[PDB]
Amino acid sequence: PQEKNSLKDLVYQAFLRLGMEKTARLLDALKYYGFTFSTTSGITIGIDDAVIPEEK
């Protein structure tokens, strides 16, 4: 799954191989889709989202 480190690595590699113009375009793309999907994902915070484990 794509997270901070993997995405960072992607940006570095893309910088190296494809150069900074294409890396810029890639960054803008990632920004766009990241935002768009995060909107509809359903992510929220309720008080029940902090889950007290029984084990406690």
Partner: protein, 221 residues
């Protein structure tokens, strides 16, 4: 798929400790003297804290705030001192032609003092990536030539060769050994880390250095 878990794991927001304060116990707290209370808060922020607990935590919070506020000034002062000491250093030429260099160790003595162990990856990368080799290095059937700027893969490779026991240290051109007057040269410096390519002559590396050291000053705890 729980929101807290997801945000924490993805690196979007949060760390295990804050999450722990939310769903867990708040934990141990320090007295104003730095001494720790024997009685921890057993309550999370979800459950809510008793007024006594809250008060106990306020000490630590305040101490932290004061610490940060006092820290910023010293960080700034240090940064300015660095800027002042390094400001005349700029890359003034392509090669100073020095035969001098430094050897970056890939291995460090263990605290048990039992043997030598491999240094952490990030550390090696920190002392290696972008640097120019001062000597020929032959490892794992690969030729790394004198004058070669080490890419990331070159560094990872050297790490592999070290794990294979072929090389314990890497000769490299460094500003410590650079003979360029009033500044450094291109080779002794190496990559312009922003561009991942050899540094352009005229880059002021003194100011970049000072800023690079100073900037995460207020982060140091």
């Amino acid at each position: 798929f729980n929101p807290l878990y997801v945000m924490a794991q993805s690196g979007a927001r949060g760390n295990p400790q804050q999450i722990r304060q939310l769903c867990g116990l708040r934990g141990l707290m320090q007295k104003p003297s730095g001494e720790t209370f024997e009685v921890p808060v057993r309550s999370s922020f979800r459950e809510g804290l008793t007024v006594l607990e809250y008060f106990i935590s306020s000490h630590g919070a305040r101490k932290g705030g004061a610490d940060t506020a006092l820290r910023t000034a010293d960080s700034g002062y240090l940064t300015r001192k660095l800027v002042d000491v390094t400001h005349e250093i700029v890359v003034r030429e392509a090669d100073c032609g020095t035969t001098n260099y430094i050897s970056v160790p890939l291995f460090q003595p263990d605290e048990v003092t039992r043997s030598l162990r491999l240094r952490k990856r990030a550390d090696i990368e920190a002392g290696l990536y972008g640097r120019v080799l001062a000597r020929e290095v032959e490892v794992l059937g690969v030729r790394l030539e004198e004058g070669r700027y080490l890419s990331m893969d070159d560094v990872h490779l050297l790490i592999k060769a070290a794990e294979a026991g072929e090389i314990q240290e890497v000769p490299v051109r460094s500003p410590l050994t650079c003979q360029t007057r009033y500044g450094v040269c291109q080779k002794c410096y190496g990559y312009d880390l922003s561009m991942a390519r050899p540094v352009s002559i005229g880059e002021a590396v003194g100011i970049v250095a000072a800023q690079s050291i100073g900037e995460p000053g207020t982060q140091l705890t």
